[PDB]
């Protein structure tokens, strides 16, 4: 426990012991919240394994370019080592906690107007400069072919219900759903990474999943959660800020969300734990309703 403060002190950040709090449940990083002697709030990301350092390396280079381009705050890494990532605690409360406690209702026009503005600014940023950070880059042809390749990989290792496959086969063949341009995307945009103050976004956490690809990636969860008119509030703010949404985008987000079992299937293959393919096989092949 006190080794954390020696670890923090070794990197020139003397924190108060009594104010230190742990958030141990995290997979990649064990997260700690602290107050310094100066009064500043600090977030400690302690890498659990060496595997997490590569995406943390790409993230730091992506955050260094990103801060000037967004109105909302983004983690300002001031310490990035093999032992600790430390940035000042960003303002705002999360829109989501995990039991399951929400802090912003998805039917809020204020949050929808905020999301569409943040996403539009993120997507407006030059992709070639974003690519130099080392993130994944996929053209509009490659984002669509990726799902084609993902379906083949999962369908080769898991039995898949025809009701689900046929829906995704129909989703992959419908030209109207698919984007014609690629942008810089957050990759996992949902309220748990959206810090809010009076239902307005003030900072965006966690950019490990950032990549150049489908613009609908960062709008999907809102499309799936919010009422139809509320999602067009976000789309209106998205368009007025430079976003270029296509008519079949809302359907595309719903179809993409129904393909989450494909994501669980790819995860269980890289992970290998039998419980993680227990749930993937159950998602890709649901039993009979009784
Ligand atoms: Cl180092």
Residue 205, Cα to own-chain centre: how many angstroms? 8
Residue 236 zone, left/alpha/beta (φ > 0; ψ -120 to 50; rest): alpha
Sign of CA dihedral 68, 73, 78, 82: negative
CA distances from 56 to 22, 45, 62, 148, 163 (A): 20, 10, 10, 29, 39
Distance 60 CA to ligand 1 centre (A): 13
Closest CA to 140 of 169, 180, 103, 168: 180
Give the whole-angstrom CA distance, residue 60 versus residue 206. Answer: 10
Distance 42 CA to ligand 1 centre (A): 20
Q: Look up tokens 């999360």; give the residue.
A: 94
Distance 8 CA to ligand 1 centre (A): 14
Q: Could you write out the DSSP letters of every residue in 135-157? A: -EE--HHHHHHHHHHHHHHHHHH
* b (16+ CB within 10 A) / e for 163-172: ebeeebeebb
45 has binding-site annotation:
yes
Closest CA to 36 of 2, 13, 7, 9: 13
Compute how many other C-beta atoms are within 10 angstroms of the C-beta atom of residue 62: 21
78 has binding-site annotation:
no
Q: Look up tokens 């009076």; give the residue.
A: 198
Distance 182 CA to ligand 1 centre (A): 33
> Cβ contacts of residue 151 below 8 Å, gap of 6+?
165, 168, 172, 262
198 has binding-site annotation:
no
Structural method: X-ray
Q: Kindly report the backbone phi and psi dihedral angles of residue 76, in degrees, each rounded to the nearest multiple of 5, phi listed first.
A: -90, 90
Distance 59 CA to ligand 1 centre (A): 15
What the chain holds in terms of domains, given with CATH numbers, is: 1-94 (3.30.200.20), 96-284 (3.90.1200.10)
Element at 19 (helix H, strand E): none
Asked whether the beta carbons of 46 and 29 are under 8 A apart, the reply is yes
Give the whole-angstrom CA distance, residue 156 versus residue 187. Answer: 25
Distance 1 CA to ligand 1 centre (A): 22
Distance 209 CA to ligand 1 centre (A): 22
Residue 22 zone, left/alpha/beta (φ > 0; ψ -120 to 50; rest): beta
| Residue 234, both tokens | 């976000």
Compute how many other C-beta atoms are within 10 angstroms of the C-beta atom of residue 82: 9
Asked whether the beta carbons of 199 and 112 are under 8 A apart, the reply is no
Asked whether the beta carbons of 195 and 206 are under 8 A apart, the reply is no
Distance 66 CA to ligand 1 centre (A): 23
Element at 232 (helix H, strand E): helix 228-240
Q: Look up tokens 């083949």; give the residue.
A: 152
- Cite the beta strand spans of 170-247 per DSSP E: 183-185, 194-197, 200-204, 211-213
Distance 53 CA to ligand 1 centre (A): 10
Q: Look up tokens 């999943």; give the residue.
A: 209
Q: Give the single-character DSSP code of 271.
A: H
Asked whether the beta carbons of 179 and 216 are under 8 A apart, the reply is yes
> Cβ contacts of residue 67 below 8 Å, gap of 6+?
74, 76
Q: Kindly report the backbone phi and psi dihedral angles of residue 183, in degrees, each rounded to the nearest multiple of 5, phi listed first.
A: -135, 170
Count of CA atoms in the C-beta half-sphere (13 A) of 191: 26
Q: Edge-to-edge strands of the sheet including 211-213?
A: 136-137, 211-213, 183-185
Count of CA atoms in the C-beta half-sphere (13 A) of 1: 8
Q: Give the single-character DSSP code of 210.
A: -
Distance 55 CA to ligand 1 centre (A): 14
Give the whole-angstrom CA distance, residue 36 versus residue 18. Answer: 11
Count of CA atoms in the C-beta half-sphere (13 A) of 167: 16
Give the whole-angstrom CA distance, residue 260 versus residue 22. Answer: 31
Closest CA to 107 of 186, 223, 219: 223
Give the whole-angstrom CA distance, residue 78 versus residue 185. Answer: 24
Give the whole-angstrom CA distance, residue 232 versus residue 216. Answer: 13
Distance 91 CA to ligand 1 centre (A): 28
Closest CA to 207 of 75, 114, 41: 75
Distance 81 CA to ligand 1 centre (A): 4
193 has binding-site annotation:
yes
Distance 80 CA to ligand 1 centre (A): 7
């Amino acid at each position: 426990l006190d080794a954390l403060l020696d670890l923090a002190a070794r990197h020139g950040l003397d924190l108060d012991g009594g104010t230190l709090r742990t958030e141990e449940i995290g997979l990649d990083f064990r997260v700690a919240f602290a107050r310094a002697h100066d009064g500043g709030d600090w977030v400690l990301r302690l890498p659990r394994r060496p595997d997490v350092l590569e995406r943390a390396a790409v993230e730091g280079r992506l955050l260094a370019m990103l801060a000037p381009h967004l109105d909302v705050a983004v983690p300002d890494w001031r310490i990035s080592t093999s032992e600790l990532i430390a940035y000042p605690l960003l303002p705002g409360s999360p829109g989501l906690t995990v039991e399951v406690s929400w802090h912003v209702d998805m039917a809020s026009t204020v949050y929808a107007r905020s999301l569409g503005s943040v996403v539009a600014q993120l997507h407006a940023v030059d992709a070639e400069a974003a690519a130099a950070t080392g993130i994944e880059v996929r053209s509009p042809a490659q984002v669509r072919g990726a799902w084609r390749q993902d379906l083949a990989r999962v369908g080769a290792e898991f039995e898949i219900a025809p009701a689900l496959r046929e829906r995704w086969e129909a989703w992959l063949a419908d030209d109207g759903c698919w984007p014609g341009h690629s942008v810089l995307t957050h990759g996992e945009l949902y309220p748990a990474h959206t810090l809010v103050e009076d239902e307005r976004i003030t900072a965006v956490l966690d950019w490990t999943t950032a990549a150049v690809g489908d613009p609908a990636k960062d709008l999907m969860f809102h499309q799936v959660s919010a009422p139809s008119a509320i999602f067009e509030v976000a789309l209106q703010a998205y368009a007025e800020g430079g976003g270029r949404p296509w008519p079949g985008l809302a359907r595309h987000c719903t179809e993409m969300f129904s393909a989450a079992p494909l994501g669980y299937g790819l995860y269980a293959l890289a992970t290998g734990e039998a419980a993680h393919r227990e749930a993937a096989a159950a998602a890709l092949n649901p039993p009979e309703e009784r």
